[PDB]
Symmetry: D2
């Protein structure tokens, strides 16, 4: 509930199914520790990555495997992935939606942050 990822294909106007997503948290050592992973559903959404308790203050990285998505459609895209890095929960708990809009040579990402 605190962290959701949503992915859309701007060529077809359709959610992207089965796209891999990895989340990492920046370590006290400054390394990227694996934190959660999953794949998008038929709606293009990935829920259930974490809980309010586990999702503490930190720097988080959401890495979306956009290249495998395009390659499965026959396309050699520009980007290796889409990677979103942000500080979370530093003013207390929030709910974060990380959205990505994909084209072969472009991507856009927006964050919708709300207070529960």
């Amino acid at each position: 509930c605190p962290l959701m990822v949503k992915v859309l294909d701007a060529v077809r106007g359709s959610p992207t199914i089965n796209v891999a997503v990895h989340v990492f948290r920046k370590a006290a050592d400054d390394t990227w520790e694996p934190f959660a992973s999953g794949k998008t559903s038929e709606s293009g959404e990935l829920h259930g990555l974490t809980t309010e308790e586990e999702f503490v203050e930190g720097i988080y990285k959401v890495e979306i495997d956009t290249k495998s998505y395009w390659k499965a459609l026959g396309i050699s895209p520009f980007h290796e992935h889409a990677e979103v890095v942000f500080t979370a929960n530093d003013s207390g708990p929030r709910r974060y939606t990380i959205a990505a809009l994909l084209s072969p040579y472009s991507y856009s990402t927006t964050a919708v942050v709300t207070n529960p």
Copy 2:
């Protein structure tokens, strides 16, 4: 010089060449009267649409014929065109660049306004 249009293709990663662009000025009776037009260059740009003398304050519309572009590439598009409607020079003349980034089912338009 006061108005320029620059268009990019997010599918191919290239400027959009030979895209038609039409510019209109809102008339007093709230209709759109045609004002200038052209086709983007090989750099995706359209210069020379108007002059400082002619580009007075008012409401302007820029229409980019995105549907014809995508049809020429054999790609099904969503929109009939991409539009930008804006008020010009409300606080003095400026240079306006209308930058458009095109995908078949999405577009963004940004104004880069320099004094």
Copy 3:
């Protein structure tokens, strides 16, 4: 259900509440006939604009009053509105989500089209 509009503020990362939306349909005469209107909810969404029966083949125009939104926040934005023009239902009935992402000098719009 066949037509939904969703609007987000890219400065704050938040849905835009109370934004006016007007829909028009291109006439047999080639005029823009008023078709439906409403305002976005606290989620930034506007539902219930039309029905499958009324929403026939045609060229439709969705006009979002982004300028009033910015002016209420003290900002003089570049665009007078955000206007999305598209052919609908020409290959049969579909569900359309028209999304807009707003900044004072920029907007993005994407269409998500699905088959029920």
Copy 4:
């Protein structure tokens, strides 16, 4: 000449001036080794990062320090930075322009690749 970065500010409608940009090359041990850096000009552009000789095939990362830009403007940002990771010249050398459009809670990056 082979790599250029261009950055626009969607809030103010201007190029982003004095934004730091760092470029890295993936090393064989899968770490990022620093390769070039600079600050955007008054046109929002950063030229001269590398040369055709040095810009060989491989995986490159471009980091744009968007957070520092927004902090300088007194605007709260979401992201730590904007990134682009790409494979270069897989089918020959090309000119790459990485165009980034920035808002405090959203960004887009587009590659304009010309031969």
